[PDB]
Amino acid sequence: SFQRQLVQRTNTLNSSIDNATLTILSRFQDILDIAINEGKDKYTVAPEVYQIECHTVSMVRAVE
Amino acid sequence: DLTSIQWRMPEWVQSMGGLRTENVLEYFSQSPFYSHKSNNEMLKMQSQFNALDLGDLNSQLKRLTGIQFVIIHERPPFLWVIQKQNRLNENEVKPLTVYFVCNENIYMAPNAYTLLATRMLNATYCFQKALTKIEKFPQYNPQEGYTYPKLSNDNLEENKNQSIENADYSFSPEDFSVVRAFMQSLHSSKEAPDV
Amino acid sequence: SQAYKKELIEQIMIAQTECSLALDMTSLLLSKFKENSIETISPFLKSTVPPSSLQFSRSQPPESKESDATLAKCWKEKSLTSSCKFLFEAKERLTSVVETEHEYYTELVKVKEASWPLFNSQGSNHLSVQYSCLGGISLGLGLIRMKP
Amino acid sequence: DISTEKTVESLEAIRHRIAQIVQSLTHFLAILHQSESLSPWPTIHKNFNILLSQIHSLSNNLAAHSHTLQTTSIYPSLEFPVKEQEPLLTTLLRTKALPEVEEWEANTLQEYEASISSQPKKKEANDAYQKDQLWDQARIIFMEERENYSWFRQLEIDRATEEQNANQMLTDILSFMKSGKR
């Protein structure tokens, strides 16, 4: 039918939107979880850096 | 520094007629890893003085608490395991760092977490490098996808499927075609006489 | 060109090796009894010696240098600075992209204001004009090529 | 003795993580091999996300068990001849970091000590503790604040009822043309 086509399309649009926004906000939100420094093992710090950069790239990507 | 570093005195071991039981401990005495505080040291002093006042090893070691390097295991004529320990009681003892004869060589036993985290370090570092090399490279444009600017094109010859049906007459790139097939047909043909 | 993936292959490969050694030594470590990990090792290693070479050793944490704690700070601060520079740079290039953006669809407004048919193309993604709107016989289309 | 079981189990999980990440590496190279040109970006970024999921899963896997991992040490047992495997087992004993990595570490310490030169007796790690607490508060306020904001019409569904009565009305009018009945 003519209706459900535009409707489901709208569903796709809203889906992509909420997914992108939620992506950005999530990636930023977890950086604060990564933000902790003191008390960590020297090795444990290392992955977290790459995690920061990857979260940032994920943010800019969802922006795209 | 006192970890993975190698050490050896092959002329010594060759001089000994090969390691046996006490003499391999003497080889540990040869080692930089050897401690003056070790019960083996003061027992060595006891051999220098009391001499006769000695009883094998463990019967002499276990009753004399302190730093020790008991031979828990061995693999003649190659490996010889030597566990460090610290006696407290007739029963109680603290296990300590392994040292061993890695064929006329001595290496301290690595901690598991240190090397697992080491490899994790190496991997995550390769990941950081993996990200940094390609950052600032996907020249994005919403209109044109993830462009990668280049000196020249070929080389090799979302749901945006919508377009007018018949199209023709029309235009639509076809930015390039067959030009690769020119020269490649030429080289496939240059080998033709060879074929 | 290509050298990026060409080097990246070396990077991921070497990292995969560095990890594979862990996978193997640990598989040997847990194959001391269970068959679950002996299956996973490379035959080249299984060809050497039967596993369970490793054994427990309860000996100290042991200890850590204070400078490592300084590294924990130094890495993270640089990472955060990299984060801010990254976000700022991305805002810059995206601002330039918007500069490219406003120029175009406004032109499309200039044409649509003059009442012309408009249609999307293939993967080229540019909108295109049905220039033969007055018609005659055959259909006609034309992409509005960007000309920086 | 009992803790050895803790090791076998925690590493039962960690080896699984290693299987996951190495398998991801195999799949990743398997993707890059498919390309003759450069691989498309989105798949690549997706791959890095898979990576982050894995390494984060492993760091999480380290847990309190990591302390137990610290307690342990690596030595060959009686079961293992070193007749030819010695050169490779030494590689297995190699807890040493990649030389470029430690080189980078010296590159970090040299400049931190350079900061110490520019700032002799001005340690701030202690202040950085309460600042980390500031991250701890800022994150919580950041979480709670987002919920305050709005986040996402049956009448449009009712439009279908409009089409419905329009349809029955069509049945009515066709009945009319058929018969003139009203």
Side-chain angles (χ1 to χ4, degrees), chain A, chain B residues 1-156 161-195, chain C, chain D:
Chain A
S1 68
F2 172 80
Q3 296 297 322
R4 62 173 64 91
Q5 295 171 337
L6 295 176
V7 173
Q8 292 174 335
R9 181 178 62 83
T10 304
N11 293 336
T12 59
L13 299 177
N14 289 336
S15 65
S16 63
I17 292 169
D18 286 342
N19 291 337
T21 60
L22 187 146
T23 300
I24 297 170
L25 298 181
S26 296
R27 298 291 181 270
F28 180 82
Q29 184 171 353
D30 293 346
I31 296 170
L32 296 174
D33 297 346
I34 300 171
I36 295 172
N37 185 30
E38 182 175 359
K40 292 177 178 176
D41 181 68
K42 61 173 292 181
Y43 296 92
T44 58
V45 177
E48 297 176 350
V49 175
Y50 170 76
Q51 293 176 335
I52 292 171
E53 294 177 349
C54 183
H55 285 82
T56 59
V57 176
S58 296
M59 289 174 68
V60 178
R61 177 176 173 83
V63 173
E64 292 175 348
Chain B
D1 55 353
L2 295 174
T3 60
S4 64
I5 59 102
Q6 61 177 17
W7 182 90
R8 66 184 183 278
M9 188 65 72
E11 296 84 357
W12 184 92
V13 178
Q14 186 173 355
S15 177
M16 296 303 295
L19 298 177
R20 183 65 63 184
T21 300
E22 295 82 357
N23 61 347
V24 60
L25 294 173
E26 184 180 3
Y27 181 75
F28 179 81
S29 296
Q30 296 295 102
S31 65
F33 294 93
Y34 177 79
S35 178
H36 57 284
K37 294 179 297 298
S38 63
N39 297 137
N40 296 132
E41 182 67 14
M42 64 191 84
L43 292 174
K44 179 61 174 172
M45 298 299 293
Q46 186 172 354
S47 64
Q48 292 180 337
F49 295 103
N50 291 337
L52 295 176
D53 291 344
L54 295 174
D56 293 345
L57 295 173
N58 292 283
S59 65
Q60 179 62 262
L61 290 172
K62 292 181 69 67
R63 66 181 181 88
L64 195 149
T65 59
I67 303 302
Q68 296 181 342
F69 301 97
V70 295
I71 299 171
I72 58 170
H73 294 85
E74 62 181 341
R75 293 285 296 173
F78 294 156
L79 175 63
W80 287 278
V81 179
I82 297 169
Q83 185 173 356
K84 184 177 182 179
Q85 64 177 18
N86 192 342
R87 295 287 294 169
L88 274 67
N89 292 337
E90 69 281 3
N91 291 284
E92 183 178 2
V93 59
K94 183 179 296 298
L96 270 70
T97 60
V98 178
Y99 295 136
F100 55 85
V101 178
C102 184
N103 288 284
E104 69 188 344
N105 289 332
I106 292 173
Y107 300 135
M108 179 178 71
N111 188 337
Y113 171 75
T114 57
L115 55 78
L116 294 174
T118 296
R119 296 182 180 278
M120 181 172 176
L121 172 65
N122 299 337
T124 188
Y125 176 76
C126 293
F127 297 154
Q128 294 177 337
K129 182 175 178 290
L131 190 147
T132 57
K133 290 161 62 181
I134 294 94
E135 65 184 341
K136 295 176 179 177
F137 178 79
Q139 182 64 260
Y140 170 72
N141 186 339
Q143 186 62 57
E144 296 176 350
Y146 294 138
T147 58
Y148 304 138
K150 305 307 291 184
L151 298 173
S152 65
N153 296 130
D154 53 353
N155 288 338
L156 297 173
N161 294 338
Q162 292 180 336
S163 65
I164 295 170
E165 294 176 350
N166 58 30
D168 182 70
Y169 179 83
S170 175
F171 172 79
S172 63
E174 192 177 3
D175 187 7
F176 63 92
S177 64
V178 183
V179 175
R180 179 178 180 269
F182 304 169
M183 296 295 292
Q184 290 183 336
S185 63
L186 292 171
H187 303 300
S188 62
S189 66
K190 185 188 70 62
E191 296 178 352
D194 291 345
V195 174
Chain C
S1 180
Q2 179 64 262
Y4 293 139
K5 188 180 71 65
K6 178 183 73 181
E7 294 175 350
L8 190 147
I9 290 298
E10 182 178 2
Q11 297 303 319
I12 304 302
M13 182 67 179
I14 291 171
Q16 184 170 353
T17 58
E18 186 69 15
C19 296
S20 65
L21 270 62
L23 177 63
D24 291 343
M25 67 176 285
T26 55
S27 296
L28 298 175
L29 175 61
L30 276 65
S31 60
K32 293 181 69 66
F33 301 96
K34 301 301 181 181
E35 295 176 351
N36 61 348
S37 63
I38 186 64
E39 297 176 350
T40 58
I41 65 172
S42 64
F44 174 79
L45 298 176
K46 181 58 167 61
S47 63
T48 61
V49 178
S52 178
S53 298
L54 305 180
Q55 191 174 357
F56 59 89
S57 178
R58 183 54 52 86
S59 176
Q60 296 178 337
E63 71 277 3
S64 296
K65 290 180 294 297
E66 71 285 4
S67 64
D68 297 344
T70 63
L71 293 175
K73 183 181 173 64
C74 295
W75 299 357
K76 288 186 63 63
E77 294 302 319
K78 293 177 179 178
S79 66
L80 296 175
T81 57
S82 296
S83 177
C84 294
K85 292 189 299 296
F86 180 78
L87 299 178
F88 298 161
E89 289 170 347
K91 185 194 69 61
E92 298 304 321
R93 65 181 183 87
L94 288 179
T95 302
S96 62
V97 171
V98 176
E99 296 176 352
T100 60
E101 183 70 11
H102 185 66
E103 292 176 348
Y104 178 77
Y105 292 86
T106 55
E107 182 69 16
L108 296 177
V109 173
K110 297 184 179 73
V111 178
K112 182 69 178 295
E113 183 68 14
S115 296
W116 292 87
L118 297 174
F119 298 97
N120 54 31
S121 178
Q122 299 84 2
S124 60
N125 196 32
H126 290 82
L127 295 176
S128 62
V129 175
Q130 183 178 355
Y131 60 89
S132 66
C133 184
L134 296 174
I137 298 171
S138 63
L139 293 175
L141 274 67
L143 271 66
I144 302 100
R145 181 62 63 184
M146 293 180 71
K147 298 304 289 185
Chain D
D1 290 344
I2 300 169
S3 64
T4 60
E5 295 176 351
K6 297 176 180 177
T7 61
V8 175
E9 294 172 350
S10 62
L11 295 173
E12 184 67 15
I14 291 171
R15 67 176 296 276
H16 186 277
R17 301 291 181 271
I18 297 171
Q20 292 175 334
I21 184 168
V22 173
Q23 185 59 58
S24 66
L25 298 174
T26 59
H27 176 60
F28 176 74
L29 293 178
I31 293 170
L32 295 176
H33 300 162
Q34 296 297 102
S35 63
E36 178 64 16
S37 62
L38 177 61
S39 296
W41 176 256
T43 302
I44 298 170
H45 180 276
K46 179 181 172 61
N47 297 134
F48 295 113
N49 288 339
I50 297 170
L51 296 175
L52 187 149
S53 177
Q54 295 304 321
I55 292 104
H56 186 63
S57 297
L58 190 148
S59 64
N60 293 338
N61 195 344
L62 298 176
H65 296 81
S66 177
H67 182 279
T68 302
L69 297 174
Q70 297 173 336
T71 60
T72 57
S73 296
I74 291 98
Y75 59 89
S77 64
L78 296 175
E79 299 180 354
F80 178 82
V82 294
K83 297 176 179 177
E84 293 176 350
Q85 301 85 1
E86 184 177 2
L88 58 82
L89 183 139
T90 55
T91 303
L92 294 174
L93 297 176
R94 183 176 182 171
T95 186
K96 182 179 179 180
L98 291 174
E100 182 178 2
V101 177
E102 294 175 349
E103 178 181 1
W104 177 85
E105 292 176 348
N107 289 336
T108 58
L109 291 175
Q110 63 183 17
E111 295 178 351
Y112 175 73
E113 293 176 351
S115 65
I116 298 170
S117 65
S118 63
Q119 293 179 336
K121 293 176 179 177
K122 293 176 180 177
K123 295 176 179 178
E124 294 178 352
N126 190 341
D127 293 344
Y129 172 77
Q130 297 90 5
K131 183 175 293 298
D132 290 344
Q133 185 174 355
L134 297 175
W135 294 98
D136 179 67
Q137 295 301 320
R139 62 179 297 275
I140 295 170
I141 302 168
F142 174 80
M143 292 178 70
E144 296 178 350
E145 178 65 15
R146 294 174 63 246
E147 299 305 321
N148 303 132
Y149 296 133
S150 178
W151 295 98
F152 296 159
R153 296 181 182 275
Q154 296 83 359
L155 280 67
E156 293 174 348
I157 302 168
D158 294 344
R159 292 173 59 85
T161 61
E162 177 185 2
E163 294 178 349
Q164 181 63 259
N165 65 42
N167 291 336
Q168 182 59 60
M169 187 170 177
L170 186 145
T171 301
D172 296 345
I173 191 63
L174 66 82
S175 64
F176 174 81
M177 294 183 287
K178 180 181 291 296
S179 63
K181 292 178 179 178
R182 294 181 179 275

